[PDB]
Design a protein around this ligand. Sequence first.
Ligand code: HEC
Length: 153
Amino acid sequence: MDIGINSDPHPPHHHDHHGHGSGWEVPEAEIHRENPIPPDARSLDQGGVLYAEHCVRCHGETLRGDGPDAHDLDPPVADLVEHAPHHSDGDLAYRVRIGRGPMPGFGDALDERDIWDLVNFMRDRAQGAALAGTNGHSPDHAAGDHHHGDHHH
Ligand code: HEC
């Protein structure tokens, strides 16, 4: 007989949950297309200096984000070790090489050889942190909580 609100002027439905996690602009195609990474200690160590030369002074060597001279710098920094498994190789290699300008874009500051090292040390470190059994959340330090699997306890 009488309608209070007719359904039509509006569309069927277009509700989204936005993006959660990183958010950085990086085409999935650049993230998964080319990434030459040599897996060694030198890539880890030397790759560890790349970021440590200038980036650690604000947020940890690479993943820790413990920052040594960040006390005067902007508010506390995030922990990349927790977000590392969330970031792919092409993405970090893509950001270090092309970046945007402000912070990333060290493709001219570093070489590809370094870029893979930056990718190696973060990739190795982030993984070593997973061993502790924290991947997916915070690290548990409760003794006698681990599942079946001791080996040298
Ligand atoms: C302070 C003087 C900084 C210097 C020098 C560098 N970065 Fe930085 N970076 C800084 C802040 C405050 C933040 C925000 C972190 C937060 O808590 O929100 C960042 C962040 C990044 C990120 C993003 C991390 C992520 O969660 O995805 C990247 C990839 C990054 N910074 C890279 C980077 C590099 C390569 C630098 C050296 C060349 C570098 N930063 C220096 C502060 C500062």
